[PDB]
């Protein structure tokens, strides 16, 4: 029914200040349905990514006005009312699938006419493991009550799309792991330094990507804020 669970957008879109802009997410599955509580983000260069709609409509707070979200028919749809150059960025839409997230993958928008944050999640820049080890890496969550939050963790692997991996939710300890990452990830948190984090182990090339944090809860705007992003190499 759902394990081969597919979310497909528009490979790119063009566009130019003030036109508007209609992003589509549609879901293998059947519909796209309220229960998918869609998010859309948006990635920007050097992997640096902003939430703008969760739960399938809510724009998050300080997103412009410009961005909306619905359902419409059977897809979930992301309008820019009067695009501007700084759109000009990979949009990914995020379907919930009962026990996972799974992202669409990725629209990339380009905006002809080219030329701090209260929350912040802290990722370190760059780790480098041998294969066949482990690594671990931490996102301490500044500027925002972190036990009220989960972290969700996030890849994405070089030049392609985002791939969820688990989440912990610091309060219950409750741990989700996607079945892509049950044996590649152990997630942990401590409050008192509001730190989570991901141990990957069983290291290959493969492993080579960017890991990202970000944050989510019950009915909130998941991934509204999101880490750096960490590049792991693996490599003899
Ligand atoms: O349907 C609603 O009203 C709200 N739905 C959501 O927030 C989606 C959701 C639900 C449960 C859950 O464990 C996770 N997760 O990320 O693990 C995400």
């Known amino acids: 029914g759902s394990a081969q669970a597919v979310v497909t957008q528009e490979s790119a879109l063009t566009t130019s200040p003030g036109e508007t802009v209609t992003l589509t997410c549609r879901s293998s599955?059947?519909?796209?349905?309220?229960?998918?509580?869609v998010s859309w983000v948006q990635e920007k260069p050097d992997h640096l990514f902003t939430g703008l709609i969760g739960?399938?409509?809510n724009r998050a707070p300080g997103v412009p006005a410009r961005f909306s979200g619905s359902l419409i028919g059977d897809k979930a749809v992301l309008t820019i009312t009067g695009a501007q150059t700084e759109d000009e960025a990979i949009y990914f839409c995020?379907?919930?699938?009962?026990?996972?997230?799974?992202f669409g993958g990725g629209t990339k928008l380009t905006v002809l006419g080219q030329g701090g944050s209260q929350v912040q999640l802290q990722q370190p820049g760059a780790e480098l493991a041998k294969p066949g080890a482990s690594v671990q890496l931490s996102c301490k969550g500044s500027?925002?009550?972190?036990?009220?939050?989960?972290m969700h963790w996030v890849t994405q692997r070089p030049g392609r799309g985002l791939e969820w991996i688990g989440r912990?939710?610091?309060?219950?300890?409750?741990?989700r792991y996607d079945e892509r990452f049950k044996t590649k990830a152990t997630l942990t948190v401590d409050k008192p330094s509001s730190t989570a984090y991901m141990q990957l182990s069983s290291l290959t090339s493969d492993d080579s990507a960017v890991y990202f944090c970000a944050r989510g809860c019950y009915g909130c705007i998941h991934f509204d804020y999101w880490g750096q992003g960490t590049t792991l190499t693996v490599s003899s």
């Open positions: 739960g399938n409509k």
């Open positions: 995020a379907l919930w699938y009962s026990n996972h997230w799974v």
């Open positions: 912990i939710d610091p309060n219950s300890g409750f741990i």
């Open positions: 599955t059947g519909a796209v349905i309220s229960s998918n509580f």
């Open positions: 500027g925002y009550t972190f036990p009220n939050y989960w």
